[PDB]
Amino acid sequence: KAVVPGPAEHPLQYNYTFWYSRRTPGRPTSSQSYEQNIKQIGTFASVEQFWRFYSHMVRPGDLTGHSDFHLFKEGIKPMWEDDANKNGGKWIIRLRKGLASRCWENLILAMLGEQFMVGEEICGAVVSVRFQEDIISIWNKTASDQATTARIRDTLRRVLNLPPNTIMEYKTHTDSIKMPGPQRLLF
């Protein structure tokens, strides 16, 4: 079962797993329910194995519904509850429609190619497709590590071509957990 690079393939620093989820906004969501709505697509160990999945995948810009792709180090679930994520957080970038597919490709290539240079800190990346915008996120292990979170922010600026006036926001997962005019109906 264990995934290894093939004979002539180019090995990665880590194995990674693609995940996919589709839901609706505003669901009363426990740990167990969240985990049931996310599914593993495939795991890879080499650059060539990456492209075998990625070249055959729907681009996030072409997904319908309230849907997400997650690409995380093998053994890390894309959930706050995972031991690797419990003390962590994420940089988020919000994008108008039409930009997510290119941004996602740049993000995951930078991640896989070890462009962040924060040791073991990266957990994974998410692209979230929503009603009138898309969101791209990168998760790391230790939210309190200011050197790490700053290095990640700067790397995103370096590898992504963002519209002028693009806000980046850092959210600790513990802040996310405890976060609450009209109710938000379409997202």
């Binding site: 180019h10 990665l12 620093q13 650059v47 492209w51 740049n106 190619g113």
Partner: peptide, 16 residues
């Protein structure tokens, strides 16, 4: 650490 630049990664797209 195993590091790859973007260009190298893209170049691998056309090999199995």
């Amino acid at each position: 650490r195993i590091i790859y630049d973007r260009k190298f990664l893209m170049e691998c797209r056309n090999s199995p």
